[PDB]
Amino acid sequence: GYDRALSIFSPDGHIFQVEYALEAVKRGTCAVGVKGKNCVVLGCERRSTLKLQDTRITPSKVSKIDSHVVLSFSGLNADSRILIEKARVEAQSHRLTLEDPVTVEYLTRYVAGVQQRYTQSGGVRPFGVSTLIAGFDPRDDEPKLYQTEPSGIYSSWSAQTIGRNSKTVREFLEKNYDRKEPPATVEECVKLTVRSLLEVVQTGAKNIEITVVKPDSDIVALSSEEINQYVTQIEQEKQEQ
């Protein structure tokens, strides 16, 4: 039906649709992820403009693609869960075709490929989402964290954040996280992720959601009564020092 090209090379070389999707992502909720020796933590915030949103049926910001690999996004929430559905069905097809649980690298490559194709195909605007992929490969304990941009470029990050005010979280991670010396415990990773969030969220312990990913098919979602527990000693150690 619609064959008109929507992504056209600008006279300065950039693609206007892709660089507009960059800003569309820049207005999304902040999402941050860090990795330890054997633990990767995906931290995220929620919108506090409106209240009376329950927790049980509210769609989780971090969506489970498989038992060993999880995904978190930022930006336009509408389009991101489509990528989630495509990634899940592709993972099942990969299980059928290769008799092997999917790897983080392959899934991230597929997501970058589908975003690239939508930037390529005519009549379709590029995705306005930016995704974070975390998990553990089968029989491997190494946490892998991957970021996928709407432009289609993917890279590994020891600690990356996306969304609004991502510059502040980036510079915070640039000095309170060491790439060569990652935190050695799940508690330390969670504490770093939480302390990173208060630099932007500035209250909102109710709408701070954190997912901890562990090897051997272990994915947990810390509830509020533990997040506020971490926040207690974090704010206790903040002002007194």
Binding site: G1, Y2, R4, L6, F16, Q17, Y20, A21, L22, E23, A24, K26, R27, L50, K51, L52, Q53, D54, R56, I57, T58, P59, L76, N77, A78, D79, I82, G123, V124, R125, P126, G128
Partner: protein, 244 residues
Amino acid sequence: GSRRYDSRTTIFSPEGRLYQVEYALESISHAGTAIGIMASDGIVLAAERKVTSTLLEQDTSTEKLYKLNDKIAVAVAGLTADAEILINTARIHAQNYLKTYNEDIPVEILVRRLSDIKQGYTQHGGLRPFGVSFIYAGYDDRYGYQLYTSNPSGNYTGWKAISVGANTSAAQTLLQMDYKDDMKVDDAIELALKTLSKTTDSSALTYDRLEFATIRKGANDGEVYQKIFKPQEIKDILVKTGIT
């Protein structure tokens, strides 16, 4: 050349939001208001039909509340014409789910199917997005009562109390103070009626322009009773709420 007449519906703005869904979210505000309250015993859906006159038929007339399944009912806020196709597709999807699994379709599945339908048009095809937002209510053994909402953007979130349509902010502010976690059906109904009275643009509250849909669970367990309040029973709750 068939280019100058194109409007480029699916185009990113210089700052970076879509423009057609932006104006759909304005078209929503110009439609009749709807209210949805999540109570412990059930869910109450009420809406005030717009453009009312003495010649409007009320005996058999439902334009804002629609039935998709014996357990799941929805509230329409926006262009009824565009909502009709979505309602038909939702009913088809629910019946196909009953075909495939022979078990009642959970609300989240249908909500996703409709959100995907909206998103498909907001993404490609170059067609205008649907200018309708839904309010989903239903029951199951998974999470109990569920109360979602939809948008022309195709995003859905869970809500303990929502009101999409005209004067959304006023209705939300009014309901948030009076909302607790322990009402029965009657308390939610009277709260919704008071909110509609305090948000309407007319003077009084006559039974002609109010529609009610309630979800109740009594002696029978596992099956709720879906009743669309007819005008004869509609005029009854007016005296109970004191508005009369």
